[PDB]
Amino acid sequence: GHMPDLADLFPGFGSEWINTSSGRIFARVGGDGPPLLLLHGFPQTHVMWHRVAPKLAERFKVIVADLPGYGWSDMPESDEQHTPYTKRAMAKQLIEAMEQLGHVHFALAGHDRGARVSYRLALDSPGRLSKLAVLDILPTYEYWQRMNRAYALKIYHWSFLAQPAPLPENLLGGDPDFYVKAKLASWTRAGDLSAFDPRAVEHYRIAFADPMRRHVMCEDFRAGAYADFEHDKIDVEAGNKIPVPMLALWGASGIAQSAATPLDVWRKWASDVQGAPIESGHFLPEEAPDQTAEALVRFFSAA
Amino acid sequence: LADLFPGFGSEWINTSSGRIFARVGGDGPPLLLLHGFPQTHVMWHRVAPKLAERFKVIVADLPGYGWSDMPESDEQHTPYTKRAMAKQLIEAMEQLGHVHFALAGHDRGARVSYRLALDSPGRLSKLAVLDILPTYEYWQRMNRAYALKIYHWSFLAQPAPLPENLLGGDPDFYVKAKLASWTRAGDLSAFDPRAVEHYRIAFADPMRRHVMCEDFRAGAYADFEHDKIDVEAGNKIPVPMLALWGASGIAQSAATPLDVWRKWASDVQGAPIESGHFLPEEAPDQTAEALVRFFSA
Numbered sequence: 343g344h345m346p347d348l349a350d351l352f353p354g355f356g357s358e359w360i361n362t363s364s365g366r367i368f369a370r371v372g373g374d375g376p377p378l379l380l381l382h383g384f385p386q387t388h389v390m391w392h393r394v395a396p397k398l399a400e401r402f403k404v405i406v407a408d409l410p411g412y413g414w415s416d417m418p419e420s421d422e423q424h425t426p427y428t429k430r431a432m433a434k435q436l437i438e439a440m441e442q443l444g445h446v447h448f449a450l451a452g453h454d455r456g457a458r459v460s461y462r463l464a465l466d467s468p469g470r471l472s473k474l475a476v477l478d479i480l481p482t483y484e485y486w487q488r489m490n491r492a493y494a495l496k497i498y499h500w501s502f503l504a505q506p507a508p509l510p511e512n513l514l515g516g517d518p519d520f521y522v523k524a525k526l527a528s529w530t531r532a533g534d535l536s537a538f539d540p541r542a543v544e545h546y547r548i549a550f551a552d553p554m555r556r557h558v559m560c561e562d563f564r565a566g567a568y569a570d571f572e573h574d575k576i577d578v579e580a581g582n583k584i585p586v587p588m589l590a591l592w593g594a595s596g597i598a599q600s601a602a603t604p605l606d607v608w609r610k611w612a613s614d615v616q617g618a619p620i621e622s623g624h625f626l627p628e629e630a631p632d633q634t635a636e637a638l639v640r641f642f643s644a645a
Numbered sequence: 646l647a648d649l650f651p652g653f654g655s656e657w658i659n660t661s662s663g664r665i666f667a668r669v670g671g672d673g674p675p676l677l678l679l680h681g682f683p684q685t686h687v688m689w690h691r692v693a694p695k696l697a698e699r700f701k702v703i704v705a706d707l708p709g710y711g712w713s714d715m716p717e718s719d720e721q722h723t724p725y726t727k728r729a730m731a732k733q734l735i736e737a738m739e740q741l742g743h744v745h746f747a748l749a750g751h752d753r754g755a756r757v758s759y760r761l762a763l764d765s766p767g768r769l770s771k772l773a774v775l776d777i778l779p780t781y782e783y784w785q786r787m788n789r790a791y792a793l794k795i796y797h798w799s800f801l802a803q804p805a806p807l808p809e810n811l812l813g814g815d816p817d818f819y820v821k822a823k824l825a826s827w828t829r830a831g832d833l834s835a836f837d838p839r840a841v842e843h844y845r846i847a848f849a850d851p852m853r854r855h856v857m858c859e860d861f862r863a864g865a866y867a868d869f870e871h872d873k874i875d876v877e878a879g880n881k882i883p884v885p886m887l888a889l890w891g892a893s894g895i896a897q898s899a900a901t902p903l904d905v906w907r908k909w910a911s912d913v914q915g916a917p918i919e920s921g922h923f924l925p926e927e928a929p930d931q932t933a934e935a936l937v938r939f940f941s942a
């Protein structure tokens with residue numbers, strides 16, 4: 343990268359700045375074999391995969407991308423409908439990025455916001471995917487449908503960060519380090535930062551220290567309250583199911599299981615889905631790296 | 646800070662939980678007015694004079710708000726539950742010899758008010774609540790649309806110190822954004838600038854902001870459970886009641902306010918006022934006449 347004091351958490355992996363019509367996508371690229379794209383979420387960057395990507399690179403050509411607007415990827419200017427940070431637009435952009443590498447059909451694993459890009463990609467463009475894995479999420483529509491007093495208090499940030507600009511931007515900008523560390527710790531099993539490599543945390547903190555990066559994150563959640571929700575509602579009410587073979591992995595103490603049985607939910611959205619919990623909080627690839635890596639290796643390797 | 650209550654004195658009223666500050670004016674039957682979030686007693690400055698033409702008007706800062714003392718909170722946020730606040734204000738009124746009085750409240754103060762009516766109806770001759778539904782009714786309506794509309798009910802109720810830390814960055818911005826965004830105009834032009842300064846100065850103290858978060862923590866937990874018991878018991882406020890709400894306020898957002906209150910009260914009348922949330926400042930003339938006519942009748 344271009345940040346002198348941030349650590350290289352993928353020894354041996356190359357680096358790519360991939361041009362697209364919507365801006366550059368940064369990625370680390372390693373391994374060889376069938377192509378597998380990995381997508382991080384909030385409030386993280388591509389380095390969240392640093393503990394599982396080497397194991398995956400033993401069997402796949404692994405592409406670890408920063409989401410549009412996150413990490414070192416470019417930050418398109420948003421609009422009144424939060425368009426570039428909708429999962430539909432993010433998926434189109436990452437499809438464009440993968441074509442630049444010559445990948446028109448690939449395997450895909452996503453976590454948190456990246457998992458939302460991933461199932462939206464499967465709904466809009468299923469021919470692009472051989473197999474899909476989503477980590478510690480339910481569909482955005484399903485989160486909102488479960489909204490009640492208990493859900494609103496337990497996962498408040500969906501409604502907070504979706505408030506009109508500049509309300510979340512100005513609240514997060516007073517003490518950004520405290521917020522990003524608080525969010526990282528609060529979703530782990532133990533409720534502290536012990537699950538994370540401190541060098542990865544510094545990546546997350548430096549990203550969050552940029553007000554333009556924080557604005558993108560709020561736009562992500564604004565799309566998640568509005569367009570993404572409207573997009574999802576159209577699919578579930580039409581009975582559209584993802585046909586791509588799918589794996590749902592969630593943490594036993596994560597977000598997706600808060601008030602739902604995740605595999606039953608995903609069977610409503612996908613016609614060929616398997617799933618398993620893992621004893622972990624929300625951050626599966628850092629809290630339970632070996633079990634996550636093995637589940638992904640076995641799923642993506644299965645004939 | 647400006648004096649916005651001509652002809653009103655200023656009183657510090659002792660209670661077992663700390664002092665209650667109040668402006669006091671007028672003569673005649675006693676009437677207590679209770680403000681809400683993020684304001685102080687000065688929010689009544691445009692209607693209290695007309696009320697003081699007929700009543701002894703007592704304009705109090707809520708426990709922990711404005712210039713009233715801040716009792717220490719606990720793990721169930723007890724002193725800032727509306728049941729506790731009502732008890733403390735009942736004590737303050739007894740210091741003045743008022744054991745039967747009329748009551749009007751707005752926002753948090755309206756929640757103190759209907760809880761007071763449910764707990765101790767003998768204290769009230771009449772009750773007015775401005776731009777609210779019962780706390781239980783907000784939470785039962787907390788779907789996607791409402792969670793986005795009143796996000797602060799969940800945000801300010803997050804465990805300390807998350808909202809405290811975020812509010813400390815730019816407190817002037819937050820109090821001004823809450824005031825502006827709930828009015829019809831969406832700016833601060835409906836408020837007297839001197840009144841806004843009162844609100845800003847109070848919000849500038851981290852101890853006052855913590856109390857407000859404890860208030861919203863009570864609203865998500867104990868207050869909700871207290872309301873739920875009354876719902877399950879079929880309890881209705883027997884005190885004659887007035888529900889005023891802004892046509893573009895919060896109470897009307899996801900519900901029909903008079904239909905809701907008639908499930909909570911056996912003798913309630915009401916009307917919308919063309920106004921956002923802050924009835925006594927956005928629409929002082931219509932609010933004052935409605936209140937005068939109700940508390941005289």
Ligand SMILES: [Cl-]
Pocket residue numbers: 343344345
């Ligand atoms: Cl480098």
Ligand SMILES: [Cl-]
Pocket residue numbers: 383454455479
């Ligand atoms: Cl998410």
Ligand SMILES: [Cl-]
Pocket residue numbers: 478479480481485597598
């Ligand atoms: Cl979820």
Ligand SMILES: [Cl-]
Pocket residue numbers: 681752753756777
């Ligand atoms: Cl309120």
